[PDB]
Design a protein around this nucleic acid. Sequence first.
DNA 1: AACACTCGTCGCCCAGAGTTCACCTTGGAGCCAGGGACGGTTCATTTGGGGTGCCGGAAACGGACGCGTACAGGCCGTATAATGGGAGCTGTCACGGATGCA
Length: 88
Amino acid sequence: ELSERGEKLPAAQRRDMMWICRDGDRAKNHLLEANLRLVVSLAKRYTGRGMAFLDLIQEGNLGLIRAVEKFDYTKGYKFSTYATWWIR
DNA sequence: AACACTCGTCGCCCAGAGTTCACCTTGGAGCCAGGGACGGTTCATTTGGGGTGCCGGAAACGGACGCGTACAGGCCGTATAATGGGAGCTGTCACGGATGCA
């Protein structure tokens, strides 16, 4: 929003925003690397037909990306239950 | 064993078979002369008929044209919890050389 129709942002008001942006992206990454184990545990079951183990794993990884992007913590549910549907 | 009769065979002699040799007729075979009518040709009609180009238009007909419907394929989302694969079967030998360790 500040890019066009903004203000000459001072350093105190710019560096903090940049830092929190990087922090959020890093936290997202961290959750993904945490839950790849759930991804592989789910994808182990669909083997033996069509495509290979690693292809299934990477498709589950894409599904996990989608699940994290569309997750909602306010609902007070464990993340695994929501992510399983998207992985599948 | 002694004795007294009738029949082919031939020649000859006269008449015609039928054949030749050899005489008169007469229906010609055709040759030409003359006269149709005749069928092939040609040319006058003769209006009975074929003919037609185009259209008013009536109706089919071919298609455009606009606007509805139809599954096929695609996108999307599902909130207890569910957090590291089965399986592979492997009896070769020669052997040159790199090669990871010596």
